Design a protein around this ligand. Structure first.
Ligand SMILES: Cc1cc2c(cc1C)N(C[C@H](O)[C@H](O)[C@H](O)COP(=O)(O)OP(=O)(O)OC[C@H]1O[C@@H](n3cnc4c(N)ncnc43)[C@H](O)[C@@H]1O)c1[nH]c(=O)[nH]c(=O)c1N2
Ligand SMILES: CC(C)=CCC/C(C)=C/CC/C(C)=C/CC/C(C)=C/COP(=O)(O)OP(=O)(O)O
Length: 452
């Protein structure tokens, strides 16, 4: 078959893959990006389409404009199980036309010298001499089966992780996902009968009965269009998520016109710390494939762009040293962990605590204001549950006269603090990965027991 040689092969053109291509463009490298979907459908995976504005600023990513920006977000209203207490969190964000923006990022990267092949699937990984040296592609637009060699393969295949899963199981880069470390999520976009009240605000409904292990959401895409859906924890034996959706839709979205359905569908969402290493010999993994999703609220498009940035940084370093080993690509880990990874690890622990709380716990916690918005902002943005804040909440929880998991909040804050410092001390070399990883596991397995 035909053989082509590139510097970098990016597999997957999602938020992760497109950002990696964008950040790498116009810097002396020959890049090829492939995606199984046709160009017009790239980036249409079922999503809430809600991304923070802060993510676009930090990475120097182009703002969504025109048709790419369906609705400006100014904050989030989150509700209690009994709908009695409503917290409001202010902050600017965007309700996106995800495929439209995703395709502009691709188009711009293409204008910057990056070659993009749509309708192309990476079938078989080229693994020779202990290294990832490319992949076998199938371009069904030209019906070709090409062999593409590369110094670095960027794995950005989403939750399916279809490429790296076909690699030898001895590679740390083939770490799989535990069922309970993921949520299944489903959403629909409908037009509403009446105009949406406070359409510049997102709505999040916490309820362990209507969405166990997750939550419901009401994300307005305009004055009369809303993205409504839910997420539940996998590997728990819960019935189909569409059963939960069909049963409790009217509670969280009574205003929607069910005869004006636009899109529908669902997918898997990783809710854990990232891969213990996101880089190995001749390969870097980003996006959902590298578990870059926020463990608490499930947002992963912002952190996918971040992983793409760090992937671009590490690859440029690898070429300047001519070293494409795990050691030569190790900056991928150091960069991402400092940017979002260390936060994920801390929120991984906090997630496990939240998922086991009862509706009575959440109702009491929100009504009695165990934390204020000042520390809530500090939480899901820095991953820090300050010990002074936990103490302030525990004094309120002390007023509870019934048994509850809330009484372990201080111990949770200490475990979060512990694993946070552990990730900030991420191994400087691949030869320390095994030792560090087992220490992380010990922290987690210990914590799982402390919640009982
Ligand atoms: C229902 C629901 C709701 C939400 C969310 C998820 C889900 C399922 N998320 C998470 C967010 O959707 C997700 O984390 C990001 O899209 C991750 O971007 P990726 O590019 O890694 O994935 P993505 O799946 O988009 O990328 C995979 C791409 O690679 C291609 N591909 C795969 N295998 C291939 C192969 N072998 N060869 C070629 N191409 C291949 C696929 O065709 C696809 O284009 C979210 N996030 C957020 O920030 N806020 C939100 O509101 C939500 N809400
Ligand atoms: C539904 C699933 C699976 C995930 C949803 C993921 C979420 C909640 C995304 C929300 C992103 C968004 C539009 C946030 C806007 C509101 C907000 C609190 C933004 C916080 O970001 P910053 O802009 O940094 O906040 P500040 O600058 O105000 O501190």
């Amino acid at each position: 078959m035909k053989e082509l040689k590139y510097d970098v092969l990016i597999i997957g053109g999602g938020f992760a893959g497109s950002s990696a291509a964008y950040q790498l463009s116009r810097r002396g490298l020959k890049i090829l990006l492939v995606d199984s979907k046709p160009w017009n459908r790239i980036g249409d995976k079922p999503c809430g389409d809600a991304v923070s504005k802060a993510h676009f600023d930090k990475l120097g990513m182009p703002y969504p404009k025109g048709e790419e920006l369906e609705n400006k977000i100014n904050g989030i209203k989150l509700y209690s199980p009994d709908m009695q207490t409503v917290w409001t969190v202010n902050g600017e964000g965007f309700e996106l036309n995800a495929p439209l923006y995703n395709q502009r990022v691709l188009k711009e990267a293409q204008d910057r010298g990056v070659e993009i092949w749509d309708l192309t699937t990476a079938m078989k990984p080229i693994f020779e001499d202990g290294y990832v040296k490319g992949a076998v592609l199938f371009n069904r637009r030209t019906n070709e089966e090409l062999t593409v060699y590369s110094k670095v393969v960027v794995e950005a295949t989403g939750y399916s992780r279809s490429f790296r899963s076909k690699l030898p199981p001895e590679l740390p880069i083939t770490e799989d996902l535990d069922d309970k470390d993921a949520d299944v999520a489903y959403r629909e976009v409908l037009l509403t009968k009446e105009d949406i009240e406070d359409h510049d605000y997102l709505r999040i409904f916490f309820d362990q009965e209507t969405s166990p292990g997750g939550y419901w959401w009401y994300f307005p895409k305009g004055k009369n269009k809303v993205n409504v859906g839910l997420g539940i924890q996998g590997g728990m034996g819960y019935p189909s998520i569409h059963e939960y959706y069909k049963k409790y839709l009217d509670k969280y979205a009574p205003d929607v016109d069910k005869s004006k359905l636009l899109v529908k569908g669902g997918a898997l969402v990783p809710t854990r710390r990232p891969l213990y290493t996101m880089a190995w010999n001749g390969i870097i993994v980003i996006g959902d494939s590298g578990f870059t999703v926020n463990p608490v609220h499930g947002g992963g498009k912002g952190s996918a762009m971040i992983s793409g940035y760090c992937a671009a940084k590490a690859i440029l370093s690898a070429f300047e040293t001519g070293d494409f080993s795990a050691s030569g690509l190790w900056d991928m880990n150091i960069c991402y962990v400092n940017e979002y990874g260390a936060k994920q690890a801390s929120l991984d622990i906090f997630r496990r605590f939240l998922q086991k709380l009862s509706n009575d716990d959440i109702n009491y916690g929100m009504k009695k204001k165990i934390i204020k918005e000042e520390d809530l902002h500090e939480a899901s943005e820095k991953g820090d549950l300050h010990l002074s804040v936990a103490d302030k909440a525990m004094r309120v929880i002390s007023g509870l006269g019934r048994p509850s998991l809330l009484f372990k909040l201080k111990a949770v804050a200490e475990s979060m603090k512990k694993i946070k410092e552990l990730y900030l001390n991420y191994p400087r070399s691949p030869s320390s990965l095994g030792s560090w990883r087992r220490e992380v596991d010990n922290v987690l397995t210990e914590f799982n027991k402390s919640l009982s």
